[PDB]
Symmetry: D2
Subunit: 110 residues, 4 copies
């Protein structure tokens, strides 16, 4: 499992559950092609997005649908979504900590 996403809610102190995540890889024409997607689990995590075979060097985008998450809680958020763009050159954990008007993201590469 080379790529894992974890999403946390800073308002409620809890995993961010059922948050949609879309992963894209940059194609040779500088366009983003769909690569993987899912919804975070009860633990705020999304595993099994890809395999070592498929996860070749390249530029990836992870898009987290933070707007839909805050709207379900009745809170008006600022951002349309959160995006994390990085080059893969090798276990990657992308973590995001969400508030309505702020987010932080961190990469743990182990």
């Amino acid at each position: 499992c080379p790529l894992m996403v974890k999403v946390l809610d800073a308002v409620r102190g809890s995993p961010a559950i059922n948050v949609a995540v879309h992963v894209f890889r940059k194609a040779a024409d500088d366009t983003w092609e769909p690569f993987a997607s899912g919804k975070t689990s009860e633990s705020g995590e999304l595993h099994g997005l890809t395999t070592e075979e498929e996860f070749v060097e390249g530029i990836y985008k992870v898009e987290i649908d933070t707007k839909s998450y805050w709207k379900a809680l009745g809170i008006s958020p600022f951002h349309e979504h959160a995006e994390v763009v990085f080059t893969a050159n090798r276990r990657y954990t992308i973590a995001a900590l969400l508030s309505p008007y702020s987010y932080s993201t961190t990469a743990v590469v182990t």
Copy 2:
């Protein structure tokens, strides 16, 4: 000054100087059109990107070139850039301050709206 960007360096405890910032607005055909650009000053701030008149309702993307910043300090960072995407002026003109706190493998962004 309806749109301001402030960028700080969490490694050196200093403003992040000479950071390139590009702003885009989503077009009628869902394309990102260039809107404004600049570089942060010695105080880590970028003012003067736009005017009230030009800054109409829409979805904007503020792209901060964090990679070039870290590379020039001899650090190879994780992210290609930091992107902030938001709807602006939805219910009338607001002033927006977009702040970013930068580390090589992490960044935080906050908005202050008034």
Copy 3:
């Protein structure tokens, strides 16, 4: 103005107004003695805590009363307060900006030193 505190609210995207701040300095007997205190203004800032003359070398603690802030908004937060502990003026007088970004279960603090 060698010591400044800026506090932002990540829930409302606004400065955090009327937040109590207490500063202490470590005494000769390793006790925290009161040094200065105040409340953040409408811009979330607290200036005028001290002067260059009074702000001598030492270990300082800036305690931000985040709990009272969240309670007054009807939120029961996790932390009792946010504490920032640092050595100041170790190699001559510096100016220190201590920034805090607040959420009910999380806070971040950054220092800008010049």
Copy 4:
């Protein structure tokens, strides 16, 4: 395991390993008494600090020796340490994300 600490390094994108952590409980005379301590493991985590029986309601302080961590990497840090003070009223994860001049802490309560 009601109390867990996780510490991450934002400069290197890695767990913060061998970081000393001291936990204190507020005594009736408003003094801090030692409660538990240890060093984070390879995964930046510290488990087995206390038991359900011992972890009664009260005010706790978690102190993370961030200064010693940065000094071992040859980087001059700002803070003397990072402190997290909270009331326990029930699995608590305290996470800290460390930079030389900045830290963030978050509580996940599940």
